[PDB]
Amino acid sequence: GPLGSMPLLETLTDAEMEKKIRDQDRNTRRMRRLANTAPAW
């Protein structure tokens, strides 16, 4: 049921995938707007 050590045979669904993606997107985006200074052009 719950989660554990980054497995590699626990086929998930669109909810789990979107959950991790959305979570990582909010965390990265949040830390990005407050942690990212890559200039160019």
Swiss-Prot record:
Transmembrane segments: none annotated. It is found in: Nucleus. It is linked to Rhabdoid tumor predisposition syndrome 1: A familial cancer syndrome predisposing to renal or extrarenal malignant rhabdoid tumors and to a variety of tumors of the central nervous system, including choroid plexus carcinoma, medulloblastoma, and central primitive neuroectodermal tumors. Rhabdoid tumors are the most aggressive and lethal malignancies occurring in early childhood. Schwannomatosis 1: An autosomal dominant tumor predisposition syndrome characterized by the development of multiple benign nerve sheath tumors called schwannomas on cranial, spinal, and peripheral nerves, without involvement of the vestibular nerve. Affected individuals may also have multiple meningiomas. Component of the multiprotein chromatin-remodeling complexes SWI/SNF: SWI/SNF-A (BAF), SWI/SNF-B (PBAF) and related complexes. The canonical complex contains a catalytic subunit (either SMARCA4/BRG1/BAF190A or SMARCA2/BRM/BAF190B) and at least SMARCE1, ACTL6A/BAF53, SMARCC1/BAF155, SMARCC2/BAF170, and SMARCB1/SNF5/BAF47. Other subunits specific to each of the complexes may also be present permitting several possible combinations developmentally and tissue specific. Core component of the BAF (hSWI/SNF) complex. This ATP-dependent chromatin-remodeling complex plays important roles in cell proliferation and differentiation, in cellular antiviral activities and inhibition of tumor formation. The BAF complex is able to create a stable, altered form of chromatin that constrains fewer negative supercoils than normal. This change in supercoiling would be due to the conversion of up to one-half of the nucleosomes on polynucleosomal arrays into asymmetric structures, termed altosomes, each composed of 2 histones octamers. Belongs to the SNF5 family. The N-terminal DNA-binding region is structurally similar to winged helix domains. This is SWI/SNF-related matrix-associated actin-dependent regulator of chromatin subfamily B member 1. It comes from Homo sapiens (Human). The chain holds residues 351 to 385 of 385 of the full protein.
